[PDB]
Amino acid sequence: DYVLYKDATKPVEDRVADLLGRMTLAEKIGQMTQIERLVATPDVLRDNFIGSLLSGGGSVPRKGATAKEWQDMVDGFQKACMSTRLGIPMIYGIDAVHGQNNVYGATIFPHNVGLGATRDPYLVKRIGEATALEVRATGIQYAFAPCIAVCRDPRWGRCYESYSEDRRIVQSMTELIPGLQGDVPKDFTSGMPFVAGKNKVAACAKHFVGDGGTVDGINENNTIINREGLMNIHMPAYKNAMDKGVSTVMISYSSWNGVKMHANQDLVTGYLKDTLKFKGFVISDWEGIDRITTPAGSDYSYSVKASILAGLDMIMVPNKYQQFISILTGHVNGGVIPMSRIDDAVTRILRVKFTMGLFENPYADPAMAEQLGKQEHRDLAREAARKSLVLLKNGKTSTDAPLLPLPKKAPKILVAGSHADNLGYQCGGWTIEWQGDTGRTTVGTTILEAVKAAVDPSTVVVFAENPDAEFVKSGGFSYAIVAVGEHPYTETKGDNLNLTIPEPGLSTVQAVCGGVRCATVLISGRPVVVQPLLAASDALVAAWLPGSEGQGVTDALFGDFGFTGRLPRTWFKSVDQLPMNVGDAHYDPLFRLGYGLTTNAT
Ligand SMILES: *[C@@H]1O[C@H](CO)[C@@H](O[C@@H]2O[C@H](CO)[C@@H](O[C@@H]3O[C@H](CO)[C@@H](O)[C@H](O)[C@@H]3O)[C@H](O)[C@H]2NC(C)=O)[C@H](O[C@@H]2O[C@@H](C)[C@@H](O)[C@@H](O)[C@@H]2O)[C@H]1NC(C)=O
Ligand SMILES: *[C@@H]1O[C@H](CO)[C@@H](O[C@@H]2O[C@H](CO)[C@@H](O[C@@H]3O[C@H](CO)[C@@H](O)[C@H](O)[C@@H]3O)[C@H](O)[C@H]2NC(C)=O)[C@H](O)[C@H]1NC(C)=O
Ligand SMILES: CCCCCCCCO[C@@H]1O[C@H](CO)[C@@H](O)[C@H](O)[C@H]1O
Ligand SMILES: *[C@@H]1O[C@H](CO)[C@@H](O)[C@H](O)[C@H]1NC(C)=O
């Protein structure tokens, strides 16, 4: 007999309905299940009719694996899924949040805070475009991005994953979505999922909702705000995401006024689905449903009931799939979760799969492999890094000659600091490892390498990581570039109540700037206590977490391009002011949102 869902010429909705009507309960619950590659096996995938896989942070086939190795891994999982009775392809997800960042040799773009500084939505769209290509280079069809959190407190360990404290800037940067997925048709209905085809990926607006509003920036905590505040700060960018056809939405670990987002039917079903008319699929965060309870996981049967009844479609288990499937199956068999709820989740999952062309192109394209780390994408990252830089100081007094831009020709120059020759540090979290890492973790150019690549051949470049004052004074240097700042972190590891950079950092800046005029490059995921750094420095640049292309930094330092970045966040005078955002009644910033000095290209 003719099988409608297998017919590529049929409308998505007909294909969805035709497939759904054929599915057993096990096949339906299987679709709703996302598992980590580390627990996946061909038998597991086949026997449990698994709908999706993911790589968590740092979950890779091998250290240094090529694009083809990733393709082979993903395809191996896909072959198993395609061998089921109905042959429903799995969708493979990954945190490609500043490039395809788990992957060795992938272009690493500036983190979102830096992108906010660019005020350039089209640049971000292009980044989305390049990111989709490098994700597809690895056979992966789904990126967990953009994070459209509006970070209202930089003590949050994920503040770097927010474009801004200003929702208007976050809204503008939702242009990442049509970059990743492709532009929606002119006829498009807001809330429908969209992916253009096999050279694009499904995107994910995360984390719904108010993830950036938690008390004291405590990760995964309580967002205490009235409905008006939630709706005017934390919600707006989700509506833009609907308008641009975002395929999926991930739920936040956080709570709203003490209500776990993963158990919030009013917001997930009442608002996202029933008001915004979201028609893609809603996915949990990693063990997000376990974390509904205190302690986490102490009543998993409740977790499943609450989350599924709340309106979640796909669960990022990601390990204990047997318990998830068993419990959900029991709930359906006992009438606690109605078939209609299951049918809704599967309809949404399938709609996204059919829409993106997954049934027609379930396997990787080996011709895409060379998109990974492709030089054009690095040139784009280099542009973004440069645009992201915020110049905070350029001369100690009103009558001083501006230090920047620096001349490329000088007898001898000093490059110094813990962050001057450390690729891992300049990339920050979500790079190679979940938490990021130190040193030469991938392909890129450090600030020191960038300096050496930029200067006149007659310019002697000296590197000293932590030179003492005497070395500097005796060195015969024309000037110094000194780079310091935060170490890589991700999620809760980044929560920080004092926001002072680790030492040696300040001490190195003081020692260097004491001996020669200095340009201080601050690498951070957020504003940090900066007055002492400012006081020591002739010039100081907030470079955020600029990624693999350190030449973006030197492009501005040496005057190939003028500084144009403007603060996307308030720079506080002290942490005891926090939270403190633009528009507050008591607004007393060191630098207001939007501040930035400029230079002209030499
Ligand atoms: C010297 O460097 C300054 C940097 O501020 C340049 O002035 C600035 O030109 C920018 C355009 O390159 C303007 O930025 C704005 O950007 C947003 C978003 O990208 C746009 O929506 C908006 O329309 C602007 O383009 C900015 O307004 C301007 N800043 C000020 C106050 O001067 C300057 O560029 C030159 O002068 C300005 C006034 C413009 O006429 C530019 O077209 C022109 O290139 C730089 N001067 C030189 C010699 O290059
Ligand atoms: C927001 O963050 C705060 C601070 O972490 C959370 O409060 C803390 O909640 C945990 C429960 O997981 C408490 O730990 C427990 O303490 C009791 C002490 O008798 C102990 O018997 C348990 O073994 C466990 O360690 C912790 O005390 C508590 N701390 C504070 C400062 O209140 C809060 O739950 C978070 N809120 C949300 C909505 O996520
Ligand atoms: C103390 C809190 C422990 C956090 C452990 C959870 C690690 C995963 O964290 C989550 O994982 C998803 C998939 O990788 C990401 O897309 C989400 O943005 C992230 O919140
Ligand atoms: C401030 O907090 C962070 C995170 O807890 C910590 O790493 C840092 O060392 C702290 N600074 C000091 C000196 O207390």
Q: Pairing mode, if any, of strands 91-94 and 142-143?
A: parallel
- Nearest residue to 475 (alpha-carbon basis) of 456, 458, 462, 457: 462
Could you tell which of 564, 595, 599 is best to mutate to test the pocket of ligand 1, judged by most ligand atoms within 8 Å of the CB? 564
Residue 198, SS3?
coil
Q: 373, 403, 433: which is the final residue of a domain? A: 373
Q: Which ligand is the nearest neighbour of the Cα of 223?
A: 2
Same domain, 184 and 221: yes
Task: Give Cα 354 distance to the centre of its chain.
Answer: 26
* Beta-sheet strand order (sheet of 281-283): 204-208, 248-251, 281-283
Data resolution in angstroms:
1.9
Query: 175 and 144 in one domain?
Result: yes
Cβ neighbour number for residue 599 with a 10 Å cutoff: 19
Probe target for ligand 3 pocket from 491, 492, 495, 496, with the most ligand atoms within 8 Å of CB:
491
CA 441 to chain centre: 18
Q: How many domains does the chain have?
A: 2
Residues 357 and 382 in one domain: no
Pairing assessment for the beta strands 255-256 and 259-260 based on DSSP bridges: antiparallel
Active-site residue list = 285, 491
538: its two tokens: 């002739």
**Does residue 35 fall inside a structural domain?**
yes
> Which CATH number covers residue 90?
3.20.20.300
Which phi and psi (to 5°) does residue 30 adopt?
-55, -45
Angstrom CA distances, 228 to 235, 236, 262, 405, 456, stand at 10, 11, 21, 46, 57
Alpha helices in 217-319 (DSSP H): 227-229, 236-243, 265, 300-310
Q: Is the CB of 95 under 6 A from ligand 3?
A: yes
Task: Select from 569, 505, 440, 523 the least CA-distant residue to 169.
Answer: 569
DSSP strand pairing (518-523 vs 315-316): unpaired
Q: Establish whether the linkage from the previous residue to 146 is cis, with ω within 30° of 0.
A: yes
Is the torsion defined by CA of 544, 550, 551, 553 positive or negative?
positive
Say how many CA atoms lie within 13 Å of 8 toward its Cβ: 8
- Measure 119 CA to ligand 3 centroid, in angstroms: 28
Q: Which residue has the tokens 């990926």?
A: 201
Q: Is residue 577 part of a domain?
A: no
Instruction: Give me 35's structure tokens.
Output: 């598992």
Q: Would you call 483 helix, strand, or coil by DSSP?
A: strand
Nearest atom in ligand 2 to the alpha carbon of residue 255 is 38
Same domain, residue pair 288 and 168: yes
With respect to residue 53, please indicate whether it lies within any of the assigned structural domains.
Answer: yes
Alpha carbon nearest to ligand 3 atom 3, residue: 492
* 3-class SS letters over 37-82: HHHCCHHHHHHCCCCEEEECCCCCCCCCCCHHHHHHHHHHHHHHHH
Residue 220 and residue 357 in one domain: yes
From CA 492, how far away is CA 185, in angstroms rounded?
39
The reply to whether 358 and 506 lie within a common domain is no
Type and span of the H or E element at 539 = strand 539-544
- Identify which of 219, 489, 491, 500 to mutate to test ligand 4's pocket (most ligand atoms within 8 A of the CB): 500
Peptide bond into 509 cis (omega under 30): no
Q: Are residues 293 and 252 in the same domain?
A: yes
In a domain, 300, yes or no: yes
Ligand 1 interacting residues, C-beta cut-off 6 A: 119, 562, 598, 600
Tell me which of 373, 403, 425 is where a domain ends. Answer: 373
How many Cβ atoms are within 10 Å of 105's Cβ, its own excluded?
Answer: 18
d(CA 486, CA 344): 45
Structure tokens at 335: 């009438």
In a domain, 582, yes or no: no
- Closest ligand to 565 CA? 1
Same domain, yes or no: 299 and 384: no
Cα(487) to centroid(ligand 4), Å: 11
Phi, psi of 44 (to 5 degrees): -55, -50
Which letter, b or e, does each residue of 151-166 get, where b requires 16 or more Cβ atoms within 10 Å of its Cβ?
A: bbbbbbbbbbbbbbbb
- What residues flank ligand 2, with Cβ below 6 Å? 218, 220-222, 255, 294
| Domain C-terminal end among 353, 373, 393 | 373
Burial 468-486, CB ≥16 within 10 A → b, else e: eeebbeebebbbbbbbbbb
- For residue 594, is it within any domain? no
**CATH number, domain with residue 538:** 3.40.50.1700
Q: Are 550 and 557 in contact (CB under 8 A)?
A: no
Is 597 within the bounds of a domain? no
Ligand having the closest approach to the CA of 528:
4
Same domain? 57 vs 173: yes
The parent domain of residue 136 ranges over: 1-373
Regarding whether 284 and 167 lie in a shared domain, the answer is yes
CA distances from 415 to 227, 412, 418 (A): 51, 10, 10
Both 169 and 52 in a single domain? yes
Instruction: Tell me whether residue 590 is in a domain.
Output: no
| Paired tokens of 426 | 């300049």
The closest of 239, 237, 136 to 181, measured between CA atoms, is 136
Query: Are 533 and 519 in contact, with CB atoms under 8 Å apart?
Result: no
Is residue 18 domain-shared with residue 115, that is, in the same domain? yes
Integer Cα distance of 520 and 393 in angstroms: 9
In contact, 5 and 15? CB cutoff 8 Å: yes
